[PDB]
């Protein structure tokens, strides 16, 4: 899953 601490919460894995 997306790591909101390192990348957008709606990243490609969302």
């Amino acid at each position: 899953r997306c790591n909101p601490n390192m990348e957008p919460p709606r990243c490609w894995a969302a």
Epitope: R1, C2, N3, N5, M6, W12
Partner: antibody, heavy 113, light 114 residues
Amino acid sequence: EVQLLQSGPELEKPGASVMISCKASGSSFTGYNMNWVRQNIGKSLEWIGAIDPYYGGTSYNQKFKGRATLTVDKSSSTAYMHLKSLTSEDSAVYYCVSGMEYWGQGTSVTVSS
Amino acid sequence: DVVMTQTPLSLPVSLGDQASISCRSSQSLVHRNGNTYLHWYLQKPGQSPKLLIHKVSNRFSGVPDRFSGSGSGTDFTLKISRVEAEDLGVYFCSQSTHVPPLTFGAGTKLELKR
């Protein structure tokens, strides 16, 4: 505290393939994506790709041209990176990186005839 | 892809000195969602990299106060207020605003003066 254990040093011939594993434990996981990054002799870092352990989706660095294949074995908390059509350029230390926070110990890959 | 340029490439210091490392990105790393995904890692000799700072200025778990990140847009700086021996190594910035691919600077080597 994610602990990531990588498989050992690999030696392959030009044209061949290599598969490296990364065993995740801790700590522990929030199920973050597993990334793979290599580091060449010059110490520069190149991101290869990432896979989501949950639904299995992936994002690849286009520059690898699909030579790279990331998989997860959910049943064993193990991630894998497979790289084909190896050349000397691909000689590097390969790291798995959980959610871009925690790095494995690295796997040396030497491509040589 | 976003090119990350770090300077200087090598930085000699004495223990106790303040040290400062810069990272410039070829594009703004401010995401549409208003966050800036600029991060800093340290790789000690013989080891794997470890995360120090995320999203510009947030110290990662276990990272001491002497490390501080700042900057915005395309200009960023990691400062160490009083250098310790355990701090010597290669510092890399990375960005995950514009991906794929995630990208890294080429690294800055913090070394000891004599």
